[PDB]
From Swiss-Prot, chain A:
Section covered of the full-length record: 191 to 203 of 455
Subcellular location: Nucleus, Nucleolus; Nucleus, Nucleoplasm
Comment field (misc): Present with 1600 molecules/cell in log phase SD medium.
Family that this chain belongs to: Belongs to the NOP53 family.
Organism: Saccharomyces cerevisiae (strain ATCC 204508 / S288c) (Baker's yeast)
Protein name: Ribosome biogenesis protein NOP53
Subunit structure, as described in the record: Interacts with CBF5, FPR3, FPR4, NOP2, PIH1, RRN3, RRP6 and PAP2. Interacts with pre-60S ribosomal particles.
From Swiss-Prot, chain B:
Chief localisation class: cytoplasm
Function as written in the Swiss-Prot or TrEMBL entry: Component of the ribosome, a large ribonucleoprotein complex responsible for the synthesis of proteins in the cell. The small ribosomal subunit (SSU) binds messenger RNAs (mRNAs) and translates the encoded message by selecting cognate aminoacyl-transfer RNA (tRNA) molecules. The large subunit (LSU) contains the ribosomal catalytic site termed the peptidyl transferase center (PTC), which catalyzes the formation of peptide bonds, thereby polymerizing the amino acids delivered by tRNAs into a polypeptide chain.
Protein name stated in the entry: Large ribosomal subunit protein eL8A
Quaternary structure, from the entry: Component of the large ribosomal subunit (LSU). Mature yeast ribosomes consist of a small (40S) and a large (60S) subunit. The 40S small subunit contains 1 molecule of ribosomal RNA (18S rRNA) and 33 different proteins (encoded by 57 genes). The large 60S subunit contains 3 rRNA molecules (25S, 5.8S and 5S rRNA) and 46 different proteins (encoded by 81 genes).
From Swiss-Prot, chain C:
Assigned keywords, A-Z: Cytoplasm, Isopeptide bond, Phosphoprotein, Ribonucleoprotein, Ribosomal protein, RNA-binding, rRNA-binding, Ubl conjugation
The name this protein goes by in its record: Large ribosomal subunit protein uL2A
Compartment list: Cytoplasm
Role noted for this protein: Component of the ribosome, a large ribonucleoprotein complex responsible for the synthesis of proteins in the cell. The small ribosomal subunit (SSU) binds messenger RNAs (mRNAs) and translates the encoded message by selecting cognate aminoacyl-transfer RNA (tRNA) molecules. The large subunit (LSU) contains the ribosomal catalytic site termed the peptidyl transferase center (PTC), which catalyzes the formation of peptide bonds, thereby polymerizing the amino acids delivered by tRNAs into a polypeptide chain.
Family designation: Belongs to the universal ribosomal protein uL2 family.
Positions bearing the Glycyl lysine isopeptide (Lys-Gly) (interchain with G-Cter in ubiquitin) cross-link: K45, K92, K118, K144
Residues carrying Phosphoserine: S51, S94, S158, S159
GO BP term, example: cytoplasmic translation
Extra facts: There are 2 genes for uL2 in yeast.
From Swiss-Prot, chain D:
Name under which the protein is recorded: Pescadillo homolog
Residues of the signal peptide: none
Portion of the parent chain present: 1 to 87 of 605
Miscellaneous comment: Present with 4530 molecules/cell in log phase SD medium.
Function: Component of the NOP7 complex, which is required for maturation of the 25S and 5.8S ribosomal RNAs and formation of the 60S ribosome.
Family of the protein in this entry: Belongs to the pescadillo family.
High-level lineage: Eukaryota, Fungi, Dikarya, Ascomycota, Saccharomycotina
Length: 13, 224, 213, 87, 52
RNA sequence: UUGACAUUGUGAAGAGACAUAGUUUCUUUACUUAUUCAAUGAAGCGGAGCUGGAUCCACGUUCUAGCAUUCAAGGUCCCAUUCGGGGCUGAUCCGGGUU
RNA sequence: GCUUGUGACGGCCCGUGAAAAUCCACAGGAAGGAAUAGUUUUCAUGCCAGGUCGUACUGAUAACCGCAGCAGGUCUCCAAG
RNA sequence: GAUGGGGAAGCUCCGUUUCAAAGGCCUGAUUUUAUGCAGGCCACCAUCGAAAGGGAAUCCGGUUAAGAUUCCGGAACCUGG
């Protein structure tokens, strides 16, 4: 759920 | 049209604001641009010794085009078709290759051993000491040479980005006559034509403003 | 020995100018195309007192020739300049008090002030109150002009150097006695820390070479 | 809390003009239009156009800023960059 | 001044607010008279150029 | 403070030596390209105009505490008329030097 | 009447007695906007929110410094008959 | 008092906008060469430095062993959306 890198997408529109 | 009128603008001194004009002459350029421009200008302004000034005399357009037309038929084998050739030899276990010779040390050795039929020397080589001795070596060894514009052009000849020198040593029987005719053409157009003028010092050119001042001073001296 | 005040003043420190209340450096316009070839008209908006300077200053507003805006300049006021006056600066300006003209465009005997030492430095000579420069003569072949300075010296300068017609306002200031250490104190409070002065003989030999006895 | 600046919140942040969207995506206008067509990004109209455009009444195409931010994560944009390199 | 209506910060006249009535009157007069004098000077100079 | 050497380049004129074909030393006088000083918003520099007026000038700004800003109005070629859109000019040309 | 704030003045200077954040106004008019419907959040009313740190007391012949609960030293406001 | 630069064997020094390619904004179906961004506008320098300078907006009543323009009751105002 939480980010690992500083730039993320995580795919929620 | 009664609704439109002519309203001329006075762009003289103490008048309406000046319009936008092309100010490219007054641009404060980046320092690297200024440095390369002033370096070229200084090379023009200074008196150039003959062994450097000889590199400003190159092959003309038509002769250079014919030379490169000959050499592109002997452009070397690329890495893609080398793998194809190496797989063909593995199944058998190949004819003799014909290619443009390149690489400065290799070409110098070929010239010293008198194997090079024709030598092409790029004029824009920095540092210039790498090729500044080549015309004299070719003349002493009796090898036909030609100074050409573009190490990038020679690089396209030899599948590289740049090339200081290219050399033709072995040619096919279908192109031996063309090579001989090209050698005679280069002898007529480059060796004989520029034999005297390559012995002179170059770069005796004044700037624009200094030239105008000298001409005005000469006119004032000769006529009142 | 020890360091005297003559040598201590060069370090700066407590000997720097007191410049809080100053109006700004008094200079001519930058020598641009308009002043090189024709003229330009500004307007005197106000005449103001400058702290630490005897002569009054004038605020003059010009129009920017390359952009729609106004440019403000601080001039040293010549005597007779008034608020609302039009001031003409350039090579084609007329010979009237307050106008800025090249030295080569004025006749002999012309009285100028705030004269450029070299063309472009925007005024260096005859700036104090009551002072002026006299145009002695011209040398057109060398494109030079001979002038007489307030000290009596004679100088040769470029004819493209500019000057303001007239004499600096506020003359006769030094003819009135101060009468009072307090008035001297208030005079130097707005200039710099160079007052009061102790005599070198009054000091000890370590403090000053003249000291002792 | 100190006084907040104007033209920073509300309609000023909700919408983004086309030029600003193109600059933020760092692509060309044609690529921007094709990406908007592919992803279904459509122009919108604020109820307070002067608030959205800092008092200007000039006609301007507005998009949702969060829609542009979501568009930033489309791999077709990376494919477009790869095609530019290949060309 | 940002809390009051525009009526409290202006008067119903050109340059209302920033400039007073007499200054506005004087600049109107000066503009008209100077433009008329400019027309007169243009006519006089244009005739003088041909007459010279 | 004075002198030598290096940084240090390019011409022309007059004198020296190969014994009256140009290889260098010594003076005189130029030049710019190194170096140095200053300024700017690196905006108008230098030359030329079968440019105009009378070798010189822009005849585009001087009674007045006004105004001067939206690729510039207009002229003239196109467009496909449609809310308008382009080109030359208005505002001469050339330069391998920001002044 | 005392204290204090404020106004219009007058005297003084070879002394003429801060900057910036910030707010408003004007000039200009790129533009946008109505007939069976528009415009105006600088008119009124209605909706929501406002983080972090400090905050006790002394301020002195005993809460500060002077080795002390030291006749010393230490900035300022209010002020009755 | 950094950066850009320049000094100094070096710890570091000068200097504070210069000597720097020091960054923001607008328009676009750019007469399309077909899946590669075109045309323009405006410009000067980090940061720190005042609990007496500048500065958005709050009052009264009550309440504690010790809080108070901060709590409670009532009545306001400012800023942003
Ligand atoms: Mg003594
Ligand atoms: Mg308390
Ligand atoms: Mg207390
Ligand atoms: Mg103690
Ligand atoms: Mg102690
Ligand atoms: Mg420092
Ligand atoms: Mg601070
Ligand atoms: Mg305070
Ligand atoms: Mg208490
Ligand atoms: Mg409460």
């Amino acid at each position: 759920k939480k980010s690992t890198t500083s730039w993320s997408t995580a795919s929620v529109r | 049209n009664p609704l439109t009128h002519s309203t001329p603008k006075n762009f003289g001194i103490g008048q309406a604001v000046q319009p936008k004009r092309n100010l490219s002459r007054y641009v404060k350029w980046p320092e690297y641009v200024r440095v390369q421009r002033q370096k070229k200008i200084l090379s023009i302004r200074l008196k150039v010794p003959p062994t450097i000034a000889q590199f400003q005399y190159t092959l003309d357009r038509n002769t250079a085009a014919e030379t490169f037309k000959l050499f592109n038929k002997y452009r070397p084998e690329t890495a893609a078709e080398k793998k194809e050739r190496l797989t063909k030899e593995a199944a058998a276990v190949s004819p003799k290759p014909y290619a443009v010779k390149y690489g400065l040390n290799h070409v110098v050795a070929l010239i010293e051993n008198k194997k090079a039929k024709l030598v092409l020397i790029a004029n824009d080589v920095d540092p210039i000491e790498l090729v500044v001795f080549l015309p004299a070596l070719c003349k002493k060894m009796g090898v036909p040479y030609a100074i050409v514009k573009g190490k990038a052009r020679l690089g396209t000849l030899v599948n590289q980005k740049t090339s200081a020198v290219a050399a033709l040593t072995e040619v096919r029987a279908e192109d031996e006559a063309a090579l001989a005719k090209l050698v005679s053409t280069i002898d007529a157009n480059f060796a004989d034509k520029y034999d005297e003028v390559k012995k002179h010092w170059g770069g005796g050119i004044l700037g624009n403003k200094a030239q105008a001042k000298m001409d005005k001073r000469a006119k004032n001296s000769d006529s009142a | 020995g020890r360091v005297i005040r003559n040598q201590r003043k060069g370090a700066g420190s407590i000997f720097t100018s007191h410049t809080r209340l100053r109006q700004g450096a008094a200079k001519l316009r930058t020598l641009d195309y308009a002043e090189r070839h024709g003229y330009i008209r500004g307007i005197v908006k106000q005449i103001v007192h400058d702290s630490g300077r005897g002569a009054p200053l004038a605020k003059v507003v010009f129009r920017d020739p390359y952009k729609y805006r106004l440019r403000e300049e601080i001039f040293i006021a010549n005597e007779g300049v008034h608020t609302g006056q039009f001031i003409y600066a350039g090579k084609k300006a007329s010979l009237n008090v307050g106008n800025v003209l090249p030295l080569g465009s004025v006749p002999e005997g012309t009285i100028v002030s705030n004269v450029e030492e070299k063309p472009g430095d925007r005024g260096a000579l005859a700036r104090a109150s009551g002072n002026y420069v006299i145009i002695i003569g011209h040398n057109p072949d060398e494109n030079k002009t001979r002038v007489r300075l307030p000290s009596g010296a004679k100088k040769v300068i470029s004819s493209d150097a500019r000057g303001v017609i007239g004499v600096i306002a506020g003359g006769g200031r030094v003819d009135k006695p101060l009468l009072k250490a307090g008035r001297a104190f208030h005079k130097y409070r707005l200039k710099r820390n160079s007052w009061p002065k102790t005599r070198g003989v009054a000091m000890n030999p370590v403090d000053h070479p003249h000291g002792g006895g | 809390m100190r006084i907040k600046k104007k033209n920073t919140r509300g309609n000023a942040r909700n919408f983004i003009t086309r030029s600003q969207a193109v600059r933020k995506l760092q692509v060309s206008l044609a690529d921007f239009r094709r990406l908007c067509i592919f992803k279904g990004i459509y122009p919108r109209e604020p109820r307070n156009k002067k608030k959205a455009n800092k008092g200007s009444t000039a006609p301007t195409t507005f998009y949702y800023a969060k829609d542009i931010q979501y568009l930033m994560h489309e791999p077709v944009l990376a494919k477009f960059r790869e095609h530019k390199t290949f060309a | 001044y940002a809390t009051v209506s525009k009526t409290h910060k202006t008067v119903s006249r050109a340059y209302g607010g920033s400039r007073c009535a007499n200054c506005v009157k004087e600049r109107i007069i000066r503009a008209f008279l100077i433009e008329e004098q400019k027309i007169v000077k243009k006519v006089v100079k244009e005739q003088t150029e041909a007459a010279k």
